Amino acid sequence: LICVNENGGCEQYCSDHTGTKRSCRCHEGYSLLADGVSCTPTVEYPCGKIPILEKRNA
Amino acid sequence: IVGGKVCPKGECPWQVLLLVNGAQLCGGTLINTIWVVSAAHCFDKIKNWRNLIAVLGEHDLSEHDGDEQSRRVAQVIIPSTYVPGTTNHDIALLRLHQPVVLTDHVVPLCLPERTFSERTLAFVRFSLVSGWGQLLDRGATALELMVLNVPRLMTQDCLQQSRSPNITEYMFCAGYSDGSKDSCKGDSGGPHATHYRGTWYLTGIVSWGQGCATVGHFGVYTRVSQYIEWLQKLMRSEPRPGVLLRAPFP
Ligand SMILES: O=C(NCc1cccc(-n2ncc(-c3cc4cnccc4[nH]3)c2O)c1)[C@@H](O)Cc1ccccc1
Ligand SMILES: [Ca+2]
Numbered sequence: 480l481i482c483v484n485e486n487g488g489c490e491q492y493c494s495d496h497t498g499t500k501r502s503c504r505c506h507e508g509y510s511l512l513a514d515g516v517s518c519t520p521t522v523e524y525p526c527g528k529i530p531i532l533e534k535r536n537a
Numbered sequence: 538i539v540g541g542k543v544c545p546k547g548e549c550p551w552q553v554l555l556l557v558n559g560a561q562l563c564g565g566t567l568i569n570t571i572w573v574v575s576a577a578h579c580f581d582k583i584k585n586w587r588n589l590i591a592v593l594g595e596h597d598l599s600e601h602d603g604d605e606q607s608r609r610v611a612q613v614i615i616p617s618t619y620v621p622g623t624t625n626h627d628i629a630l631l632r633l634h635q636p637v638v639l640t641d642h643v644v645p646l647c648l649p650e651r652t653f654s655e656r657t658l659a660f661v662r663f664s665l666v667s668g669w670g671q672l673l674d675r676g677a678t679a680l681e682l683m684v685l686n687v688p689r690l691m692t693q694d695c696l697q698q699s700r701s702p703n704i705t706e707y708m709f710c711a712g713y714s715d716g717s718k719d720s721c722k723g724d725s726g727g728p729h730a731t732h733y734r735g736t737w738y739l740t741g742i743v744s745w746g747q748g749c750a751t752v753g754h755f756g757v758y759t760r761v762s763q764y765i766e767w768l769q770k771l772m773r774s775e776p777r778p779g780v781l782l783r784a785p786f787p
């Protein structure tokens with residue numbers, strides 16, 4: 480997989496590595512899941528999420 | 538904001554209101570607890586720097602509901618490449634005197650990685666712009682925070698479709714040419730926010746235009762992607778005496 484295509488399958492940030500290698504990353508206040516693509520909040524108020532809406536569907 | 542709607546309270550939690558001597562100046566975007574991104578041009582005519590106030594958790598200007606958080610602006614950082622009275626390199630990084638407290642009503646917008654922004658975010662058609670700016674060309678400003686969904690144009694296309702500053706590589710066009718929908722005076726410095734896979738990111742800064750909602754013209758936005766590294770470096774830096782700081786760009 481490559482970052483330029485489909486975001487390398489990453490939810491957030493993507494890094495191409497030497498070989499057929501790819502590494503996904505997450506913004507501060509998030510952690511990367513075992514799927515190696517998904518980001519989950521680690522804090523109460525992570526960036527770019529709307530609390531009242533997150534709650535609205537929680 | 539012209540031709541938008543009221544942003545329901547708390548749904549625009551990264552939106553900042555900038556005040557000078559209690560008067561509406563410009564918008565801004567919270568990117569973390571002490572940092573706000575705005576537009577350079579907003580600070581041209583600033584007399585006394587020490588009277589600059591940033592308000593978070595604002596919604597309805599007519600009332601106080603207790604969700605509001607006001608902070609003194611400790612530092613205004615502008616790129617070296619910005620020339621007062623012009624439109625290029627229309628970005629400012631503001632350091633708050635004290636952090637805001639994150640709440641349901643006060644949340645930062647994610648400052649994306651450049652690559653991500655360029656390769657992915659840049660291709661998301663629609664994004665949200667917001668502010669307490671003029672509701673109409675030559676009109677009154679908004680009492681309630683307004684928001685508007687605008688589509689992004691490739692610059693080649695913007696130029697093609699427009700009918701005077703160049704649209705530089707440090708800019709992008711977004712909106713409509715039918716004179717119905719735009720950002721306007723008072724909105725400048727505010728966010729152009731882009732959704733991707735359940736999260737919102739800062740892609741633009743409300744900057745300028747050929748008037749507001751002028752037929753045959755689009756809204757012009759500061760291309761934030763060009764500035765990620767610049768911003769990041771500054772955020773890692775120690776404060777300096779004196780409010781205004783001109784920092785080299787790149
Ligand atoms: O006067 C200057 N600075 C002082 C200053 C302070 C606060 C606000 C304004 N100001 N006036 C007009 C608009 C504006 C029109 C518009 C239309 N569509 C979308 C966004 C828009 N914004 C605006 O933000 C200017 C110079 O820097 C000149 C300059 C430079 C850039 C923009 C405007 C004026
Ligand atoms: Ca209020």
Ligand SMILES: [Cl-]
Nearest residue numbers: 608609634635
């Ligand atoms: Cl303060």
